[model samples]
Target: MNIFEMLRIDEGLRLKIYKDTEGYYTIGIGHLLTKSPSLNAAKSELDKAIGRNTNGVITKDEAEKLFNQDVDAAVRGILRNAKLKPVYDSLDAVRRACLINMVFQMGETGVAGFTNSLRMLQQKRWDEAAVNLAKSRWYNQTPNRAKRVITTFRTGTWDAYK
Candidate 1:
């Protein structure tokens, strides 16, 4: 397949804003437009954008065109976590995706502060890593999501935590 076709297949096509796997507002195939701090904020943004009456829409062509640029910026943002970079690099793809989800919500500095978790990740101790993840304010804030992510941390699979 050609590059554009491959991109379309990889990104998929969407026109409406929906919550992504990491609980961010996303549109047009993985383009996370905003990571609102709370679900209330997400609803507010959506109301502001589409007035709650119309479907927020974009053309497939538009989505494909934007996907490359947006995904590149996202990868760059994830790459900025120097403290967790080694652990991130050492993990398999599924585990790496889990880390990215955590860092997206917590930010690089926030994720970096999970020192014990990072250490467990580095040591390939999935059980300890899972436990360390649970020992955070984040887990308290979102117990269901935390449980799902902790399960992924233990099992080494990609599971949406929300």
Candidate 2:
């Protein structure tokens, strides 16, 4: 799957603390801060490694590990619906990536509810799909990211307008 490439394209490789989609303090490729066992363990390890609280810090290797784990989990959720496999597999690479990115943000069912956009996509009406995508509440909330994905959906290339 060339996991590293996906991480670069989607996340751009952060090695320091940052806010995530929900604005929780996070690091290592969108790993959210929580009291979960694995993340807490990773945080503790980072603290011990540098001998300080450090708020949030992780090595590139550590970040990559977390990134892979997160992507794998998201992928599973995206692909869990057997009825959608054919629909997903029929898409071109760029279309697949664009929808997958949306799925990560909205989850499979959330994205599925974009019925008009889905209809346009299934009919290969790229421009209509892009328009529908940009009109959604998601676009209002994440205009920059929505632009990227909508552009990709229309042109089959990332950063088409920029």
Candidate 3:
């Protein structure tokens, strides 16, 4: 499976609108739709990506496009970080998926803050990277995901995929 499949599980699909952990209005695969600086533009976007006005529910086809956009953005976000790019490029598919998953959830800036962990992961210090990951606010806030990501990093396996 691709990163998108893993993402569906990690973020959980929500065809209808719902509040994310931080309380922002979100929809479909954790897409934050509220707090738009230009809600007009946002609304137009929603019209295109999700149907003209479906209240909040989106069709699976629409969700696929939206989810696809997010995964690409997450990958770009990781590559945009110059320091993280080489490390990202060096990893195999599963390890790469782990990085993308973290970026997708925490954002590029947030993931960038894990300098030590990034360094360890780059150096192939799997266990150390996992340890560093566990000692974070993200871990406390999302323990199950953190554990799964940690294990994936530590083992370089797709244990979470199944």
**Candidate topping lDDT:** 3
Error of 3 at 80 (Å): 2.0
Candidate 1 lands at a TM-score of: 0.57
* TM-score-superior candidate, 2 or 3: 3
Whole-structure CA lDDT of model 2: 0.68
**Residue pairs in collision within model 3:** none
Candidate 1 structure quality by residue, lDDT tens digits, 69-105: 5545445666766777788788887677667666645
TM-score of each: 0.57, 0.72, 0.88
lDDT of 3 at 40: 56
lDDT order of candidates, top first: 3, 2, 1
Across 20-139, the per-residue lDDT of candidate 3 in tens digits comes to 887766778878776555545455556766658875668777877888888899899888898779889988888999999988887888888899998998999998888988999999
lDDT of every predicted structure (CA atoms): 0.66, 0.68, 0.82
Q: Spell out the clash pairs found in candidate 1.
A: none
Error of 2 at 94 (Å): 1.9
Model 2 C-alpha RMSD vs. true structure (Å) is 4.9
Instruction: Write the candidate numbers in order of decreasing TM-score.
Output: 3, 2, 1
